Amino acid sequence: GPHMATGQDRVVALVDMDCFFVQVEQRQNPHLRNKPCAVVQYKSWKGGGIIAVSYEARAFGVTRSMWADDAKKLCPDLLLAQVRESRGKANLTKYREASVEVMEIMSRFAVIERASIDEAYVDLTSAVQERLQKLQGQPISADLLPSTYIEGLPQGQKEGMRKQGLFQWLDSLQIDNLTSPDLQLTVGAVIVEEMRAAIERETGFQCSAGISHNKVLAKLACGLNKPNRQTLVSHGSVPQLFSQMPIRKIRSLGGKLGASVIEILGIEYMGELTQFTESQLQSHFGEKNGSWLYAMCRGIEHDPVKPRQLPKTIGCSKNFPGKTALATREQVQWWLLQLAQELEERLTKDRNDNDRVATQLVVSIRVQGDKRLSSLRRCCALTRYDAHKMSHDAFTVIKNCNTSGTEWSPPLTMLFLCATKFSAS
DNA sequence: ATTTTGACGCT
């Protein structure tokens, strides 16, 4: 009743760039704009592995994790942009810099949590309050929401349906009550329209966004109407939306835990979770997951928007599959040095930009025939931004995996260096 | 022989 808090305190947005790496290449190369295109890594093996796909190319069935030659079977006019290669490995600098452009714009509006190279959460609660105070009871015009969908509306062509649903929502709005959750979301969506306009104006990149009361709902909402649209998911829309939402569609439930929720409880959709008690869910999935599931299937989640715009770790990774696996000492040293050189470059620039220094070097490896993605992860001190020292320490720290009596055995199918434990400088 | 990352939980 009155004391059942409903998780309507906050206004949170998730902004995510549409086919991000492809848009970065399309800005740089106009010939790629408004075409089926994809971004790949490498080119010798099956034309390279696809990691980003324009929506034109998606209409042919091209997806991420597809080989480019297979994709070309689906889309013979597919255009391909290749990730930069440096020191014999993929170099993602162009996209990290494009990302920093986007993040710095979003930061002007509110405090953001960088959730990936192409997406950030925004806590808009304060900003919505300020804007409601500025409006002074003025109602919200549909002109202020040109790309906004209201999930679950209309009830009772695409743009036509969007405008119908928006009209229904705006007519139902109690603009006088500065404290109504639904009004707060609506004003949040006005600000998110402004944010996405600024992002497009100042970068050329288009994006989508979700507006709701928490991070999970904002993220789920963002995907409902991609590309180049934003979606308002209200508290009241949760029962219908969740009544047919596969559990795996909710962030963090797409893997083993989601599968066990399905198998143990004997359910399919998010909504069905509501029929279990908190204690029941805690019994099956632990106290934390259980509490979180009990509130999440009612649309409630409390995870804060962390004020963090920059990555907490800086890492360099390369796989060496099958017959390219590193089998000699010279090879492991040369590739550890290549990794350490790219890492050093990134870390020096990080220090100059962000006034901080990493203090811990993590070295991770895979050995051939190991089932696990990571076979060993060991850490050492990172005291100098010197690639030669970093590669020597990584070797010093992993060399006791070589069972050879000049050789390396088992051959290494992955090297991974990661700087962590940052400290102000 | 999708690859290259990065956050975060568990013990």
Ligand SMILES: Nc1nc2c(ncn2[C@H]2C[C@H](O)[C@@H](COP(=O)(O)NP(=O)(O)OP(=O)(O)O)O2)c(=O)[nH]1
């Ligand atoms: N190297 C690498 N980069 C990746 C991988 N997966 C994604 N990226 C890169 C490429 C992606 O562009 C970017 C952000 O990933 P999304 O937001 O999940 N997909 P996108 O923005 O392309 O399309 P939309 O969001 O409109 O559905 O991260 C990967 O496995 N490896």
Ligand SMILES: [Mg+2]
């Ligand atoms: Mg994206």
Ligand SMILES: [Mg+2]
């Ligand atoms: Mg994303």
